[PDB]
């Protein structure tokens, strides 16, 4: 089903169909690391968690991080045999491509090389970004996990005007659901479920199946497998509580929720196992 209201700029079922049909073009493999026998799933978590901290330092948007995450996972599905010393170059170059796509004034190249502690030069990043984009067939416009959460939050707070393009939702509850998704994305087994399913399952744990189905269009049976998989991650967030909305200098308060944050969730990921 389609949760979007009647759209004045296009057919509501047409816009939603295109968004759904796009996910058929972008493929994800939850076991792409089997193509790289020398790598381990925990290495992917450490890299993504490091990219989260890099985004918060330069105040990059959450969309920028999840773009780099999707670029990283899809590029690895096309490659074979990667050493751990090459992971940092692929990760920071994915963030470099993502920053230039999403940010109005992205950081310069040398800043991306600066955060690598000299392990990645500027020319290495420029070489890596071309190999990433060419291997991905220049398919660099996916619907990230956080993009779906942005859609689900707008539909949850729709009025009689049905204006779905003007953002209107509480920022504090948004960053709480994104906090759960930031943990689940560290586990490589999340790729088994589509990005739209993961975002809807995280919203369900902070609300209900009725609100989930109203704003996502997916029935409870579609996300039950994802919800049951997300079960350990949700309680670890519930045991420690939810974070507060932060303020960033130079960033307007009406956009502060869109800035990527990072708290030490390393031990939070291992508590979800078993």
């Amino acid at each position: 089903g389609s949760p979007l209201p009647v759209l004045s700029w296009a057919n509501r079922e047409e816009v939603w169909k295109i968004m759904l049909n796009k996910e058929k073009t972008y493929l994800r493999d939850q076991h792409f690391l089997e193509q790289h026998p020398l790598l381990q799933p925990k290495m992917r978590a450490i890299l993504l968690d490091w990219l989260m901290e890099v985004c918060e330092v330069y105040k990059l948007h959450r969309e920028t991080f999840y773009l780099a995450q999707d670029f990283f996972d899809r590029y690895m599905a096309t490659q074979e045999n990667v050493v751990k010393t090459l992971l940092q170059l692929i990760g920071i170059s994915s963030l470099f491509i993502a920053a230039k796509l999403e940010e109005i004034y992205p950081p310069k190249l040398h800043q991306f090389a600066y955060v690598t502690d000299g392990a990645c030069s500027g020319d290495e990043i420029l070489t890596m970004e071309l190999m990433i984009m060419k291997a991905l067939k220049w398919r660099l416009s996916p619907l990230t996990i956080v993009s779906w959460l942005n859609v689900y939050m707008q539909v949850a707070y729709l009025n009689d005007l049905h204006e779905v393009l003007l953002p209107q939702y509480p920022q504090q509850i948004f960053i709480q659901i994104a906090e759960l998704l930031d943990l689940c994305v560290l586990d490589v087994d999340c790729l088994e479920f589509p990005y739209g399913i993961l975002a809807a399952s995280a919203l369900y744990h902070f609300s209900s199946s009725e609100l989930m189905q109203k704003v996502s269009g997916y029935q409870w049976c579609d996300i039950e497998n994802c919800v049951k998989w997300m079960v350990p991650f949700a309680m670890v967030i519930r045991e420690t509580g939810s974070s507060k909305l932060k303020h960033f200098r130079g960033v307007a308060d009406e956009d502060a929720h869109n800035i990527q944050t990072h708290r030490d969730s390393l031990d939070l990921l291992d508590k979800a196992r078993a």
Binding site: W9, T25, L101, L109, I125, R139, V151, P167, Q168
Partner: protein, 298 residues
């Protein structure tokens, strides 16, 4: 990178360096945009990464096709479909005789189809001007140059300010709106529509304030009734002179009743009330070009 021979330079501008190339074995002609990466300290330009990713998912008959992206030496080649002329040259060549009304209607209809396709794919063009509208010798017109384009989310957030060339920039951009979306492309197309009819730019301003006043002198100085929230916009000033809205019988004399109606809805001050590309296709101005498809009322 072979089998292609440069025939003529098409142009050098914000897009890059465009050449006309022709395949020697097949006779196929293309447009090659050359990007010399040795001069780009930030790697592939952001406008290049944006345009490539957007066009590889915007396959439409009224959108200039990106055929291939070739990385040869320290350069990046973008292979485009070739069209022989842009709309601005065609309007200037037709300035004395005037573009025939059926051709104006056909061109606007195709432009609205390509624009409705972009907007349904959640993509804003943000630089619709006659120089970016290309025509072939078979009656087709296509949208080109997506370097300033951006995919918008649902809901949108604050995007880049001061977009669109000045003559075709919507009034909400000139007044410093925080959010914007598909309405800015419709305004540009409305300016292009009137320019085809009158063979002259509708609002040829030389500054941001002069552009806004030229719009005010034609459509009237807007107020809260015609545009709710206009007096609260950052660049709005209570000292704006009060001009009366001009009768479209003088703004676009050759335009009939259905034409003036469509143009009025494309030039509505309120972006929320401005007609959409999809709705414009259903306007009675195109009642002879297209027929309504049966709608499932389920």
């Amino acid at each position: 990178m072979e089998n292609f021979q440069k025939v003529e330079k098409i142009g050098e501008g914000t897009y890059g360096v465009v050449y006309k190339a022709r395949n020697k074995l097949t006779g196929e002609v293309v447009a090659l945009k050359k990007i010399r990466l040795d001069t780009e300290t930030e790697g592939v330009p952001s406008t290049a990464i944006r345009e490539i990713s957007l066009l590889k998912e915007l396959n439409h008959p009224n959108i200039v096709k990106l055929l291939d992206v070739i990385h040869t030496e320290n350069k990046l080649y973008l292979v485009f479909e070739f069209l022989h002329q842009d709309l601005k040259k065609f309007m200037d060549a037709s300035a004395l005789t005037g573009i025939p009304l059926p051709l104006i209607k056909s061109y606007l209809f195709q432009l609205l189809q390509g624009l409705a396709f972009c907007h349904s794919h959640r993509v804003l063009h943000r630089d619709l001007k006659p120089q970016n509208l290309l025509i072939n010798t078979e009656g087709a017109i296509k949208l080109a140059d997506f370097g300033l384009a951006r995919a918008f989310g649902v809901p949108v957030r604050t995007y880049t300010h001061e977009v669109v060339t000045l003559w075709y920039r919507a009034p909400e951009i000139l007044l410093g709106c925080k959010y914007y979306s598909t309405a800015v492309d419709i305004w540009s197309l409305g300016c292009i529509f009137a320019e085809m009819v009158t063979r002259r730019a509708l609002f040829p301003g030389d500054s941001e304030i002069d552009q806004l006043f030229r719009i005010f002198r034609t459509l009237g100085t807007p107020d809260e009734v015609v545009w709710p929230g206009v007096t609260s916009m950052p660049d709005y000033k209570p000292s704006f002179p009060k001009w009366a809205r001009q009768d479209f019988s003088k703004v676009v004399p050759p335009l009939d009743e259905d034409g003036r109606s469509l143009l009025s809805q494309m030039l509505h001050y309120d972006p929320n009330k401005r007609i959409s590309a999809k709705a414009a296709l259903a306007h009675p101005f195109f009642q002879d070009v297209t027929k309504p498809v049966p709608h499932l009322r389920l």
